[PDB]
Amino acid sequence: GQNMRVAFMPWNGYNFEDSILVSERVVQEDRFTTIHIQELACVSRDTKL
Amino acid sequence: AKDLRDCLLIQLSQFAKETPWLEEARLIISDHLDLLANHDFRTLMRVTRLKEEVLKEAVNLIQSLDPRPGQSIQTSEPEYVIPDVLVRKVSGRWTV
């Protein structure tokens, strides 16, 4: 995790119940950016032909 | 099409005329298929009176015509072959 500055204040309903407002700085800071690895495999499957 | 020339003619007509060696390729596909079948380059040059070695590019382009375009419809199906005897021969010591 990261230690992010927050505040407890209702901002135009964007924190109505469980909605979180985020900073463009964080995207610029690339915080919480995730890297995912996907695997693909193949086989020959020699046939009668 | 049921005819290679017909399918090739349709494929050529699909493309634009801006490509070079288009009319020559169409003429070859029209009635010069026999020379290509026998690979009779000299006979084809004698008959069609085409530019020497300039027809090689047109021949290559005609080779890039995707013969049997309907073959993509067919999907591969594995051939279930069940063998009777299995041999490993791992680290020598072959054992049937």
From Swiss-Prot, chain A:
Entry similarity comment: Belongs to the RNA polymerase beta chain family.
Residues of the full protein shown: 797 to 845 of 1342
Subunit structure: The RNAP catalytic core consists of 2 alpha, 1 beta, 1 beta' and 1 omega subunit. When a sigma factor is associated with the core the holoenzyme is formed, which can initiate transcription. The rRNA transcription and antitermination complex (rrnTAC) consists of RNAP, NusA, NusB, NusE (rpsJ), NusG, SubB, ribosomal protein S4, DNA and precursor rRNA; S4 is more flexible than other subunits. In pull-down experiments interacts with CedA.
Name of the molecule in the record: DNA-directed RNA polymerase subunit beta
Signal peptide: none
Organism field: Escherichia coli (strain K12)
Biotechnological and industrial applications of this entry: Co-administration of salinamide and rifampicin or salinamide and myxopyronin suppresses the emergence of resistance to both antibiotics.
Annotated function: DNA-dependent RNA polymerase (RNAP) catalyzes the transcription of DNA into RNA using the four ribonucleoside triphosphates as substrates.
Post-translational modifications reported in the UniProt record: Acetylated on several lysine residues in the presence of glucose.
